[PDB]
Design an enzyme around this catalytic site. Structure first.
Site, PDB file in Angstrom:
ATOM      1  CD  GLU A   1     -21.144 -38.722  14.515  1.00 27.25           C
ATOM      2  OE1 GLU A   1     -21.376 -37.905  14.281  1.00 27.25           O
ATOM      3  OE2 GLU A   1     -21.127 -40.507  13.417  1.00 27.25           O
TER       4      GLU A   1
ATOM      5  CD  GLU B   1     -18.647 -32.451   9.682  1.00 30.00           C
ATOM      6  OE1 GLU B   1     -18.245 -31.647  10.592  1.00 30.00           O
ATOM      7  OE2 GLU B   1     -19.131 -32.388   8.503  1.00 30.00           O
TER       8      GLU B   1
ATOM      9  CD  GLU C   1     -22.094 -30.988  -2.326  1.00 28.15           C
ATOM     10  OE1 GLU C   1     -20.526 -30.416  -2.438  1.00 28.15           O
ATOM     11  OE2 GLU C   1     -22.322 -29.340  -2.154  1.00 28.15           O
TER      12      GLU C   1
ATOM     13  CD  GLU D   1     -19.864 -37.431   8.223  1.00 27.96           C
ATOM     14  OE1 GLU D   1     -19.859 -37.436   9.396  1.00 27.96           O
ATOM     15  OE2 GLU D   1     -20.823 -35.630   8.691  1.00 27.96           O
TER      16      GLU D   1
ATOM     17  CG  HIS E   1     -20.951 -34.024  16.037  1.00 28.07           C
ATOM     18  ND1 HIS E   1     -20.331 -33.112  15.834  1.00 28.07           N
ATOM     19  CD2 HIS E   1     -22.071 -34.017  14.936  1.00 28.07           C
ATOM     20  CE1 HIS E   1     -21.035 -32.078  15.361  1.00 28.07           C
ATOM     21  NE2 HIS E   1     -21.864 -32.806  14.794  1.00 28.07           N
TER      22      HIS E   1
ATOM     23  NE  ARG F   1     -32.692 -27.426  13.942  1.00 25.09           N
ATOM     24  CZ  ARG F   1     -33.193 -26.541  12.328  1.00 25.09           C
ATOM     25  NH1 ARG F   1     -32.404 -27.057  11.576  1.00 25.09           N
ATOM     26  NH2 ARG F   1     -33.603 -25.164  12.896  1.00 25.09           N
TER      27      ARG F   1
ATOM     28  CD  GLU G   1     -24.593 -36.548  18.323  1.00 22.91           C
ATOM     29  OE1 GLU G   1     -25.052 -37.123  17.466  1.00 22.91           O
ATOM     30  OE2 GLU G   1     -24.905 -35.062  17.612  1.00 22.91           O
TER      31      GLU G   1
ATOM     32  NE  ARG H   1     -24.118 -30.587  16.871  1.00 23.05           N
ATOM     33  CZ  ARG H   1     -24.929 -31.922  15.845  1.00 23.05           C
ATOM     34  NH1 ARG H   1     -25.092 -33.004  15.744  1.00 23.05           N
ATOM     35  NH2 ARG H   1     -25.683 -30.720  15.151  1.00 23.05           N
TER      36      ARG H   1
END
Lengths: 416, 415, 415
Positions: free
Chosen positions: A128, A130, A177, A185, A234, A304, A322, A324
């Site tokens: 993923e 960005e 945004e 992304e 990620h 988080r 996942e 990070r």
């Protein structure tokens, strides 16, 4: 072969072979389509000399052959004239083996090692990444001064999605945004390791081309702006064995002991992995507290700040891990291979990760990797001959960055 | 004849006759197509006066005839009106033979010498020229000062299209492999004379297309001080009745004939620079610290050697690669000199020695003056032509050596 | 010490100590005159660190002292505040002896060696430098290009006045003898070391006056391609107890000692170029068809000879004129080398032969490398110093050679 049908159907004129170097740039070479019709093109490859490339300097790279992979053949939308795009691998003319310093060959060897070990049959991975969009940017460095300056909408996003579809990727979602102005992304369906690594390059290429065509500029660097959020990538990952989600099980958040050992290995080799998952001085500007970036080297399902997360899923079929910390700058092949090998080592040693959490620098990472190289070479996937050259490149870049003098120093000290 | 057929098909109006001078520039003249329809055109040539050309000054050049080579006839893509293009040779009106100072005649005589010697039947050669593309360039020289200043699939594909239309066989188009603005285009190899003509046409096409697109293109060995130069590797081999005489057993599958070829080239290399590097700029490129070769030796892996043996899938493709030549060299003369050095090596069975493992223009001219023996062997070259060539090339060396340069002002003005 | 009375008379504020590096540039330091009053100043010098200077990069040069020479004390005309200028010598702190690489020390050692040998007593030397005057000059070299461009009694009288105020003895002032912008000022001859210092003072004066009047002045041997260069004629003679040893009976009234001197100079001329022409520019001047000499011979009438015998009215004034040297040479080293060559010639009684009637810096350096013998003779010169000098000049020559020049663009850009 798939290429013959496309060539015959659309009277392609030019063939474009592409391959990624050690640093991650996709070099390419063009030729007429005449010589691609005969099967000898796919049975013997084409001559090539890679001695000029950064990571391949030496006598050995003085003679090489490019071998196309017909599985990836596609047509170019941008070119005003029909063109056939293919990915290629590098084969040593003496031994007919994949070159040691080829990231794609390394990834294929990693897949083969997993298959031989038999812990699973395949691996599914989805990144993923960005990125940022700006109107204009300038930068300059000289012995008399340095400067960098930044000057800063369904249509453009729709055009990007259309271009990706025309390439042949399965888009799923588009964001904008979400956290700060100018950040975006695009989600894409997961796939196998090598195929996903190939698809990431196409994603980057198409994004760059569309942004340029619309007169904007786009960057994937981990942190372009000091006071804003960073750009992350990620990675969701899982292992499959005869259709069984080997990670799916009973336990904390429904993970199996195999998945827990995977997490334990990732945790143990986390520090060494930064040499591949964060191969830039910029990454450690992002990796700081007070922002969305992870801090603690731990795993969780809710926290988080943990670097490893267990997403919620409706079915055990979709159980995945996942990670990070990685960044877009990381080379896809090498990053995925390193993560896979770390996880496999953890599984083999049955390293318990411990309690689930609840309630650095590039030089340091390179130093840690140099001594932690043991597991990477396991099974012959990586080699010291390659690790050493990679370390030399990154060390040279780190030295260059460290020795330079920066404008903030004038503000802080010029008057003192 | 091919020309008759082409003219009849495409109602051509004008005929262009082209020939290369001693320096390596394609002079040309034009005629109305009406006269070319007669076979007497090809049987007798056309009157010509080449006394004005640099290397041909003298009594003989005041009267010459141009003999077209019908095998090379083609159509011009650029000209608005239909135009035919032919290459020509220079024949002495007194005795019907090629003029002594014609590089194409020299190349043909070299081929004849090889055929008579019988070591082989034919020779295959493929060069790899290289060039730079820029946006704008300026330069000026005068007693009061001197100055020089310098300032993408579409264009590359346009170049390839133009070459294909002119009739070549492209194989690959590199792009900025080493440094910005550097390009090269592979092309299918061929025999000596045909390959030389192909090189001339390639240069012409590249220049024309680059101009048409508003850019500039140069083949100088080293235009920029801080970047790599532009070389021209030459691959070659000899064939005898379909047999790759070079193919054999030994180091990298080389035959003793090939090894003697290498030995001869090694022995006569110092003299060859007078033809393969006929410019002061060449020895700016030929320096350490870059991709250019440095050591006069042969090796299959060591890239610093000046001679190499690339890997090939089949013995049929066995060839030898020479690195030191440069784009500025005259194709005909360079190929002829290399062939003669190799043939002398074979004739004297000069063993090249162990494979390696782990100058100036005036000096080259002086060395050539003494080493001229092998070139005149078989009568392909002549001492008259060699002396004329050396005398002609001396002027540029003298002029460059005697002029004053801006770096001197920086180094010495305040002293 | 003359400094004390000068300071007392003119309430001097600052003292400026000056010395010369290997390349011939004059470095200097300044200090308050308050310190120099005590004799301990002259007895002990002052600590100095010359490690950063080009030719003195050796580790030893990191700790040196400066010995002022009271004989050279003068008052500065230019400075608004009263300032006293002194020359200094480099002394090794550990040995209390002259540093091995000081040109002034080398010259003093050469004088001492001559005196000890007994062949003569003193040497009289007169140099005849030249220079060019321009309104403006610009020059630049960069990766992207290169450029250099060039654009009455008042000024000449001002220069003469400045020299007289600094204490020299002007004799004649020639302007535009053969071309625009070339001037020369004659000054009385003197002993070797004193004349060497006077040359530096003259250069400083000329530069300062030209800057004050807003023009530029250069001493480079060859600034313009189409005009005559600038050279240094060196008149030399040897005197023993008031007798002009060169005067005698023979060709043009020279003695056998003078003839052997000339023979030695002729034999060792090739090596001397390393010191009398240490700049690549000089070999642009050294070409036929201009003022520069060509033949390495001696004559009294033939202008092409590099050695001349001026006609004089008295035996007392008999002298030998060397024509090849150029202003870029370092005076100390040039004079010392000439003296050593002449002394070797005299000692070996080398006959110069019949009087004549009716290269490159690379070559010069490699020849000097072999010609060490007659220089090291007597211990005045040192092999370490020679090696360092050759290293510097070779590095400079390499820099100049391995570069691209605009003339190459006009010659080969389209080739």
């Amino acid at each position: 072969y798939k290429s013959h049908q496309l060539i015959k159907d659309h009277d392609v004129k030019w063939v474009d072979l592409r391959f990624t170097d050690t640093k991650g740039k996709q070099q390419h070479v063009t030729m007429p389509a005449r010589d691609a019709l005969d099967d000898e093109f796919f049975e013997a490859g084409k001559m090539f000399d890679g001695s000029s490339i950064a990571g391949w300097k030496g006598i050995e790279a003085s003679d090489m052959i490019l071998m196309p992979d017909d599985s990836t053949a596609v047509l170019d939308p941008f070119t005003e004239e029909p063109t056939l795009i293919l990915v290629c691998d590098i084969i040593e003319p003496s031994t007919m083996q994949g070159y040691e310093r080829d990231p794609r060959n390394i990834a294929k060897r990693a897949e083969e090692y997993l298959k031989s070990t038999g812990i699973g049959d395949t691996v599914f991975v989805g990144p993923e990444p960005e990125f940022f969009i700006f109107d204009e940017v300038k930068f300059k460095s000289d012995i008399s001064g340095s400067m960098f300056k930044i000057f800063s909408d369904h249509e453009i996003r729709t055009a990007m999605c259309n271009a990706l579809e025309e390439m042949g990727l399965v888009v799923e979602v588009h964001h904008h945004e979400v956290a700060t102005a100018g950040q975006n992304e695009i989600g894409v369906k997961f796939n196998t390791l090598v195929a996903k690594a190939d698809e990431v390059q196409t994603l980057k290429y198409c994004v760059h081309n569309v942004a340029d065509a619309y007169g904007k500029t786009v960057t994937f660097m981990p942190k372009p702006l000091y006071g804003d959020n960073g750009s992350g990538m990620h990675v969701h990952m899982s292992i499959s064995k005869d259709g069984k989600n080997t990670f799916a099980g009973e336990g904390y958040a429904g993970l199996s002991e195999t998945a827990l050992y995977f997490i334990g290995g990732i945790i143990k080799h986390g520090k060494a992995l930064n040499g591949f998952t964060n191969p830039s001085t910029n990454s450690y500007k992002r990796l700081v507290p007070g922002f969305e970036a992870p801090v603690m080297l731990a795993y969780s399902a809710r926290n988080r700040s943990a670097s490893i997360r267990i997403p919620y899923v409706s079915s055990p079929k979709a159980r995945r891990i996942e990670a990070r910390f990685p960044d877009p700058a990381a080379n896809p092949y090498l990053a995925f291979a390193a993560l896979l090998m770390a996880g496999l080592d953890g599984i083999q040693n049955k390293i318990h990760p411990g309690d689930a959490a609840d309630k650095g620098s590039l030089k340091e990472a390179l130093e840690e990797l140099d001594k932690g190289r043991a597991f990477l070479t396991k099974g012959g996937v990586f080699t010291d001959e390659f690790i050493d050259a990679y370390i030399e490149l990154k060390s040279e870049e780190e030295i260059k960055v460290r020795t330079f003098v920066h404008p903030l120093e004038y503000d802080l000290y010029y008057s003192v």
